[PDB]
C-alpha cells in the first residue's frame, strides 16, 4: 500500500479523509493547525453529514482510527515537512494556501513523489476531472495535479455528454452556490465569477471559447446547482436529453453522474457521491436546440469523491 | 378624490396599503380583513423587511386613524354583503387571493363597487394589465375585472419587451430565484424548484411572443428581494455594451421609474425596498456568439409589485371620470 | 388494535413514521387533506430526517406491503371509525384540542382521543416518564401529551425535584402579536405553556416555575434553558450526575446526558424527551442551578406519542 | 478640532466612522485599512444589515471625501509606521482586532499619538470603562490605553447595575442569545452553546459584583441583533411593576439614551440600528417567589456599542482639552 498524506484539515481536507480511510491505500499523516483533541472531534462530529461511521482516539503526537495510526504534524513550511522520512510517496493538498506549484513543490523537495491540489492550481502539470480527461493523465511528466474544483467537476461530465451526443454550439450557465464576495452571506444572492467555464479549456479544448458562467452564492448549507442553457447542433427532445443521460449513468460515467427523475429539493442531494446530479424533471427545450439542464451536487462530499478517485489513480500509475 | 377600499391584509395589501395611503390622487377608505383593530395597526407600524412605517397610526374598536385620516375596518368572509355601495366606493383592490376568479370578484361589483383590481394573476378576468408594457390596453368601459399577474411578470415582461422592440426574441429559457409538489416541503435549508407561470402568461400582456418563452423557478431561503435570469437569443447580432445601453436609455425613458439599469456591484439585500419593477444588474449581462444573451433582473416582490398596483389603481381612477 | 391518525402535517408524519416500526398497534388510516400521491412522497422523503418502501393508490396507500387508507375530510363525526375498526385515533390537526370538538370522534365510532398538543377541559394529560400511571381508561377518554416543551421541562423539573427539591424557578426555552413576524430573520419573544402545564403533570410544583419563549430560526432541534433555586446545596458534578443515574435509571429513553461537546444538530433524529448538556450545567452560590436540555421537537416528541398510543392500546386490551 | 484616527476597517471599525463622521465635539482625519480606496468607499456605502450610508463618499488614490470632509487613507501594518504625528492625530480608535495587548497597542503612542482606545477588551490595558457605568474612573493622566469592552458587557453592565442600585445582588445567572471547540462549528444550521467573558468582565467595571454572577452564550443565526437573558436574586421584595420602573426611571434618568425601556410587543429586528446599550423588553420582566428576577435586554451588537465608541472617544477628548 501506498502511503499519503494530507495538509490543511478544513473541510474538504476533512471530508477527503473520511471517506479515504479505502484499500488502495493509506492515510498516514496530517499536517495541521489544531491540536490532537480538536481534530479528534472533527473527525468524529459533522455539522453536514451526521457523525463517524468509524472510531477515533487522541493522543499527544500522533492519532488513532479504527486501530490505525496517523501522526500529526504542525509546521506551516512544507521545506520542513519529513515525507521522504515518512514514507510519504503522495502528498492530498487541502489547505488551499500553496495551490501554486511554486508553492507546491516543495512537498516534492521533503520527499514526496506527487502533489494533489483540491483546487484549482495554478502552473500545474495538470488538471484532471475524473470521468473526463483522465486519460491525459501522464504519471512521468505530471507532478502537481489539480482535481478542479466542484462546481467544475459538476459542469465538465454534463457538458461532455451533451456536446458527445448532440454538439454543442455555445452556452451559457449559472452556478447557484451554497469583490461582492465580502457582503454577508445570511441576508442575499450575492452574484460574482466563476471559474469553471473557464476552467474547460483544461480537461475539453475543443469547447474553448463556447460556454461563459456566472455564480449566485445563496444561503443554503451544502448542496448546489449547475444550471446550464446551451444550443445543440442538431434537433433535441426534452426525452432524447434525458436519455442520453440516462444512458450514460448506468454507462461510461456511472457513479460520476446520476440521472433523477423524481421532484426532489436540494437537501435530498446531501451526501451523494456523484459530480452531477441531472434533475431529470427540469430538462427543457426550445426551438428543438435550446437546452436547459439543471445538475445538484453536494460541495464536499462528490468533490472529495473524486480526490480519493483521483489519489486512488496516481496511485495506481505509480506501480 | 375617489373612494376606494382593500380586501384582504397580507403581505401584499398591507405593502400597497402602505404607499397607497400616501398617494394623493385617490383616498383610501375602507377596509377588510380576519385581523382586530389593535393588530392591524401594529401590523401597518412595525415591519421586519421595509422597516418602520413613516407616519403614525391609531387603533379603535371598528375604525383606524393614519397620518390623520379615518379607515373603516369589516371582518366580512363574503364579498356580496359587502357593504360597498354604503361607503359609496368604486375600486375595489383585492389582496386576499380568496377572490382571484373573475365570479369570485364580481360580487365587489354586485355589492355596489364598480371596477376591482387583482393583486395577483386572474382568472377569466377581463384584462390584465402590466404597467409600462400593456397599459394601453385598459379600456374602462369594456373591463371590470383587472389583474395586475405576477411580481414575476412584472420583473419579467418589462426586460422581454426592450429586448424585442430593439433586438428581436427568437427564444429564451428563463430561470426565477424566488425569495421566500416540491412545494410541500421545508423551504428554510433548501433550494426548492418548481414551476412558474410568468413566461405563459406573457401571452396575456404580450401576445407576440407566444411559445418563445419558458421557464421555472427556484425558491432559495431568502428574505425579500428575487431576481429573473434569462436566456435569450435575439434576432441580430449584439455586445454587452449595446443591450446594456438598451436599458439605460429605456430607464431614462419611456419605462422611467419601471425599470432601473445599476452598474455597482451590488447584492440581493441592495435592492430591498426599491420601487423599480425591474433592476438590472449590469455587470452580470452576457453575450455568447453575438446572438445568446444572459440579462439579470433584480427585483423586490414585494415593494416594486405592490407600487404598480397603485399605479394600476390610479389609471382606472384617472378613467372612469372620463 | 386500529388506529386512525387525523391530520397529516409535520407532526402527525413523524407519528406515522415512528409508528410503522411498531408491532404493537398498526396505523391503518390516515385523514387529510393531501393527494395520495403527495401523501406518499411526504412520508417517503422527509425533510430533516432524511428518507424512509411506499407506493399510492386513488384511495389508499401500501407501505411496506400493509393497506393504510386514505380519506379526506374536515369534520370528524362523519368519519368511518366504526365502519373502519379503529378503537384510538391519534389528532394531529390540533384544530380540535377543545374536548367538546375532540369527541366528534367518539361519536364516529372510535373509543379514544389522543391529542399531541395540549388540551382544554382534556380528560389528563401525559407525560410518559412523569405521570403515565395516572391514566385511568375507565374515566379518561380524550388524552393530551402536552408539548414537546413540556416533555422536556417535565423529566427534567421532576429529577432536580426529587433528588435536590425545587424552590423556586424561572425558565426559557429557544424553539426552531409578535408571533406573526418573519421567523426568517428574528429572534421572536413569545409565552410558553409548558411551565404552566406541570400544573396538571407535577401538581406540588405549582407556581414555583414560569416560562417564556423564544423563537429562533433553526430547523429542528430546540432547547430549554432553566434556572432553579434547589433546596439544599448542590454542586455542578452533583447535578450531573443526578441525570446520568437517572438515564441509566427509571428515565431510561427519556432522558439522556450528554458530556461531549456539541451543537444543537447533532441532536437531530434522537428519541429521547430531554437532552441534558452536561457541559453548560451552572451552579451559583449552592442553591441556584443552571441546566440546559436539548429536544428534537419532532421526534421526540412523536416517539412520545408512539408510548403513549401503546399504552392505551394495551390499557384497552385488558 | 481633535484629530481622531480609526485603525482597521471591519464591521466596528465601519460602524464606527459611520457614526463618528456625524459628530461635532471630535474629527476623523484617517483611516489605516488594508483595503485599497475603491473598496473602502463601497463599504461605507453599502451596508448590508443598516442599510446604505445616510451621505455621499468619493474615492480618491490616497484619500476619500465623506460628507465633503477629506478623509486620508493609509495602508500599513505597523503602529510604529503610522505618521499619527504629522497629520495631528492625538486619538486613535484601535479596530483591527490584532492590537488588543498594551505591549501592541503602546506604539500608536511611539508613533505620536497620546490615546489608544480598543473597541475590544483590553489585555493589561490601562482601564476598562462602560459609559453609563464606570465614566468617571478615567484619569487621563495615567491611563492611556483605553477598552471599551464588548457589545455584551456593555449590555450587561447598565442593567446589572440598575437592579444592584435599587434592589441589590445576591445571585445571577445569564445567558446572551449572540446573533451572526464549538465555535468551530457550522453556524447556519444550529444553536451553538459557548463561554462568555461577558460576566468576569463585570469584575473590572464593577467590582462589588465580582463573583455573584457567571454566565453562558447561545450563537444562533440572525443578522445583528442580540440579548441578554437574566436571571437574578434581588436582596429585597419586587414586583414586576417594581423592576420595570426601575428602567423606566432610569431611561428617563441617568442612563438616558444608554438603557432603553420597550413597553411594545417587539421582535429582535425592530432594534436593528438602536444606539442604546441595552434595550429592556418590559413584557419580559417576571418575579418569582418576590426575589428571582428574569430581565431581558436587547443590544444592536454593532450600532449600539459602536456609539458608546464614539461616546467614549468624545469623553476623552473632553479631557485632553482639560489640562
Given at each position: 500500500?501506498?502511503?499519503?498524506?494530507?495538509?490543511?484539515?478544513?473541510?474538504?481536507?476533512?471530508?477527503?479523509?473520511?471517506?479515504?480511510?479505502?484499500?488502495?491505500?493509506?492515510?498516514?499523516?496530517?499536517?495541521?493547525?489544531?491540536?490532537?483533541?480538536?481534530?479528534?472531534?472533527?473527525?468524529?462530529?459533522?455539522?453536514?453529514?451526521?457523525?463517524?461511521?468509524?472510531?477515533?482516539?487522541?493522543?499527544?503526537?500522533?492519532?488513532?482510527?479504527?486501530?490505525?495510526?496517523?501522526?500529526?504534524?504542525?509546521?506551516?513550511?512544507?521545506?520542513?515537512?519529513?515525507?521522504?522520512?515518512?514514507?510519504?510517496?503522495?502528498?492530498?493538498?487541502?489547505?488551499?494556501?500553496?495551490?501554486?506549484?511554486?508553492?507546491?513543490?516543495?512537498?516534492?523537495?521533503?520527499?514526496?513523489?506527487?502533489?494533489?491540489?483540491?483546487?484549482?492550481?495554478?502552473?500545474?502539470?495538470?488538471?484532471?476531472?475524473?470521468?473526463?480527461?483522465?486519460?491525459?493523465?501522464?504519471?512521468?511528466?505530471?507532478?502537481?495535479?489539480?482535481?478542479?474544483?466542484?462546481?467544475?467537476?459538476?459542469?465538465?461530465?454534463?457538458?461532455?455528454?451533451?456536446?458527445?451526443?448532440?454538439?454543442?454550439?455555445?452556452?451559457?450557465?449559472?452556478?447557484?452556490?451554497?469583490?461582492?464576495?465580502?457582503?454577508?452571506?445570511?441576508?442575499?444572492?450575492?452574484?460574482t465569477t466563476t471559474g469553471?467555464?473557464?476552467?474547460?479549456?483544461?480537461?475539453?479544448?475543443?469547447?474553448?471559447?463556447?460556454?461563459?458562467?456566472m455564480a449566485?452564492?445563496?444561503?443554503?448549507?451544502?448542496?448546489?446547482?449547475?444550471?446550464?442553457?446551451?444550443?445543440?447542433?442538431?434537433?433535441?427532445?426534452?426525452?432524447?436529453?434525458?436519455?442520453?443521460?440516462?444512458?450514460?449513468?448506468?454507462?461510461?460515467?456511472?457513479?460520476?453522474?446520476?440521472?433523477?427523475?423524481?421532484?426532489?429539493?436540494?437537501?435530498?442531494?446531501?451526501?451523494?457521491?456523484?459530480?452531477?446530479?441531472?434533475?431529470?424533471?427540469?430538462?427543457?427545450?426550445?426551438?428543438?436546440?435550446?437546452?436547459?439542464?439543471?445538475?445538484?451536487?453536494?460541495?464536499?462530499?462528490?468533490?472529495?469523491?473524486?480526490?480519493?478517485?483521483?489519489?486512488?489513480?496516481?496511485?495506481?500509475?505509480?506501480?
Amino acid at each position: 500500500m501506498t502511503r499519503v498524506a494530507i495538509n490543511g484539515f478544513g473541510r474538504i481536507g476533512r471530508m477527503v479523509f473520511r471517506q479515504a480511510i479505502e484499500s488502495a491505500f493509506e492515510i498516514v499523516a496530517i499536517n495541521a493547525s489544531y491540536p490532537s483533541e480538536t481534530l479528534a472531534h472533527l473527525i468524529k462530529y459533522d455539522t453536514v453529514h451526521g457523525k463517524f461511521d468509524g472510531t477515533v482516539e487522541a493522543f499527544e503526537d500522533h492519532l488513532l482510527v479504527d486501530g490505525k495510526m496517523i501522526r500529526l504534524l504542525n509546521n506551516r513550511d512544507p521545506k520542513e515537512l519529513p515525507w521522504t522520512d515518512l514514507g510519504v510517496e503522495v502528498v492530498i493538498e487541502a489547505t488551499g494556501k500553496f495551490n501554486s506549484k511554486e508553492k507546491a513543490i516543495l512537498h516534492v523537495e521533503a520527499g514526496a513523489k506527487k502533489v494533489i491540489l483540491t483546487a484549482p492550481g495554478k502552473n500545474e502539470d495538470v488538471t484532471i476531472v475524473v470521468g473526463v480527461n483522465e486519460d491525459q493523465l501522464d504519471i512521468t511528466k505530471h507532478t502537481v495535479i489539480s482535481n478542479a474544483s466542484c462546481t467544475t467537476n459538476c459542469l465538465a461530465p454534463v457538458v461532455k455528454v451533451l456536446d458527445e451526443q448532440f454538439g454543442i454550439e455555445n452556452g451559457l450557465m449559472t452556478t447557484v452556490h451554497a469583490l461582492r464576495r465580502a457582503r454577508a452571506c445570511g441576508q442575499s444572492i450575492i452574484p460574482t465569477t466563476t471559474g469553471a467555464a473557464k476552467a474547460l479549456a483544461k480537461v475539453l479544448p475543443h469547447l474553448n471559447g463556447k460556454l461563459h458562467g456566472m455564480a449566485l452564492r445563496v444561503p443554503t448549507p451544502n448542496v448546489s446547482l449547475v444550471d446550464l442553457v446551451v444550443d445543440v447542433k442538431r434537433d433535441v427532445t426534452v426525452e432524447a436529453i434525458n436519455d442520453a443521460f440516462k444512458t450514460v449513468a448506468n454507462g461510461a460515467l456511472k457513479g460520476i453522474v446520476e440521472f433523477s427523475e423524481e421532484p426532489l429539493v436540494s437537501i435530498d442531494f446531501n451526501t451523494n457521491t456523484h459530480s452531477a446530479i441531472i434533475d431529470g424533471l427540469s430538462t427543457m427545450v426550445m426551438g428543438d436546440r435550446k437546452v436547459k439542464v439543471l445538475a445538484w451536487y453536494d460541495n464536499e462530499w462528490g468533490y472529495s469523491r473524486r480526490v480519493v478517485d483521483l489519489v486512488t489513480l496516481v496511485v495506481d500509475e505509480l506501480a
